[PDB]
Amino acid sequence: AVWQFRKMIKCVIPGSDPFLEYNNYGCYCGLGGSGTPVDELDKCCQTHDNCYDQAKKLDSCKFLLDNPYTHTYSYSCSGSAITCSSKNKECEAFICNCDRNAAICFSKAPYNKAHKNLDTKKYCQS
């Protein structure tokens, strides 16, 4: 679920404000997107949204993952590292992996403050 993803971000990025920092950034950070990503972080967000689009179209998950922002999974954080629990069922594991891969991607990417709250109608249409 989305509350678990934002806790993963706090785990790998100490002292971060996940909602205020990783939503409404570039062409892809936040719900949906368009055009092409503008930096490494925006590309992490495009990858994350593509992972969620595929989750809703998987043969064995299309109904269970109708809303991936509310589907609960099992995970843990230890010394700024994320682990997706081995007890996760098929569809739970898929969404936990989408989330863990995105949180790690964000922690390695530069944060370009000039891309926060980008005019997407203007710059994300090419």
**Among residues 14 and 110, whose Cβ is nearest to Cl ion?**
110
30 annotated ligand-binding residue: yes
Per annotation, catalytic residue among 17, 39, 42, 48:
48
**Among residues 91 and 103, whose Cβ is nearest to Cl ion?**
103
The question of whether 115 is a catalytic residue gets the answer no
Q: How far apart are CA 18 and CA 25, in angstroms?
A: 12
- The minimum distance between CB 2 and Cl ion, in angstroms, equals 6
Give the count of alpha carbons within 13 A of 109, CB side only. 20
Task: Give the CA diameter of the chain.
Answer: 45
75 annotated ligand-binding residue: no
The question of whether 48 is a catalytic residue gets the answer yes
Q: How far apart are CA 95 and CA 93, in angstroms?
A: 6
Pull the structure tokens for residue 80.
């700024």
Residues with catalytic function = 48, 99
> Residues forming the annotated binding site?
28, 30, 32, 49
